[PDB]
Amino acid sequence: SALTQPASVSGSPGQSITISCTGTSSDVGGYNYVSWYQQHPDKAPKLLIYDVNNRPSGVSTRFSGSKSGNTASLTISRLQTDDEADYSCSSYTSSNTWVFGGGTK
Amino acid sequence: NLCPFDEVFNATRFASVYAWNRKRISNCVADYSVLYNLAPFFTFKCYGVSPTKLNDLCFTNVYADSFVIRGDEVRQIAPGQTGNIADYNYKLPDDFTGCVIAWNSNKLDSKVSGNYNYLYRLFRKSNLKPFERDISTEIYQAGNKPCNGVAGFNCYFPLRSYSFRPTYGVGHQPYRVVVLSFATVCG
Amino acid sequence: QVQLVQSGAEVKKPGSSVKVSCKASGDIYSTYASSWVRQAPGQGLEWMGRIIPVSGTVNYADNFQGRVTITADKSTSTAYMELRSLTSEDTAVYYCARDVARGGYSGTDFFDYYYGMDVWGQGTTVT
């Protein structure tokens, strides 16, 4: 429950950032199933990554995730000027649950 | 006539996954009306058929694989999936046509300290072909250093036990998987 | 692609009971399963439960065991959500989404929902 994840992000276009989601070794690290979501202000979220690295069809090229054994991580390259949103995680969580860790904004 | 499904599903002790006891069903009538929305049937993945119209499809043979695996290892009991349960332990064919059934059995298999009567094939350097097992165990797996004996650190003992505990998850709980496989068996 | 339509908001000050219905009638297969999330104002999501309407098998997060009863009928294949014993801290948004089954097969799999949540409702800001 409550995979900690920093809610800090620099809105400077033209650079590259990286957000690392940690977790226990049954939430993320016990599985290779960490997913990522971005959310509008006061609307529903939408899906970006599903397994570790992947993307569904309507997803740009820079949206890429990665794992590190226990600390999953998404990165953004070529930060487009108006794309900042509420980035949220998930994972298969050893009991069929998901677990969403905080946000980033 | 009737099938022995309740001799297969409602059995006392199941097989392990390394030595899945295949049970053949024939010369019988197969009533599936008590078998689709019965209460402890969490998983009912059928592939070549539809379970509503399972009561009117006559087959010449029915196999019934049965074993006990984890919750999060039912993902490998499916065609075309890779793990160490479909790869090394129990391979399901790409031309599969039966049904994969499973239900939680935390009361019947896992105990309060730990029950270690269930084993799986962690190490094997040849992938299993569909619908056969290896039951024999020998410590010689091809890591390196072909010297043989009761030892390890380069060549390891193949079979290892599940660690089953009740306060340890529901994706880590014993799921008594029964896999069906498919004109003398009608409905 | 699935066209989830959710209920309206409520101003239920605490001690009440809330039902939220998740109407979805698009690409409704036997593998369809609608999870449920909370979103509190100012912080992040919390996954609440999951229903498979073709079977009625129900998951929960252990923070919502006995608080939420996710009811769904098989023919309409749509899901409800009965949160009970409310609090003023339970003012949040309660989306419903669609867990994606990873496979082509028949109905009733309790385990395949590990892809993500692609499509969502529209939020019922329950106060």
Author numbering:
A (entry chain B): 2 to 106
B (entry chain R): 334 to 515, 522 to 526
C (entry chain A): 1 to 127
Task: Give verbatim lines from the article.
To probe how BA.2 escapes group F2 and F3 antibodies, we solved the cryo-EM structure of two representative BA.1-neutralizing antibodies—BD55-1239 from group F2 and BD55-3372 from group F3—in complex with BA.1 and Delta spike protein, respectively. The epitopes of group F2 and F3 antibodies cover a continuous surface on the back of the RBD and can only bind to RBDs in the up configuration. Antibodies in groups E1–E3 and F1 do not compete with ACE2, whereas F2 and F3 antibodies compete with ACE2 and their binding is affected by T376, K378, D405, R408 and G504, corresponding to class 1/439. RBD mutations on T376, K378 and R408 can lead to escape from neutralization by group F2 antibodies. Indeed, these residues are centred on the core of the BD55-1239 epitope and are fairly conserved across sarbecoviruses. Notably, D405N and R408S, which are present in Omicron BA.2 sublineages, may alter the antigenic surface, disrupting the binding of F2 antibodies and completely abolishing the neutralizing capacity of F2 antibodies. The overall positions of residues 375 and 376 are displaced by more than 3 Å, which probably further decreases the binding of group F2 and F3 NAbs in addition to the T376A side-chain substitution. As expected, group E1 antibodies were not affected, whereas group F2 and F3 antibodies displayed significantly decreased activity, following D405N or R408S single substitutions.
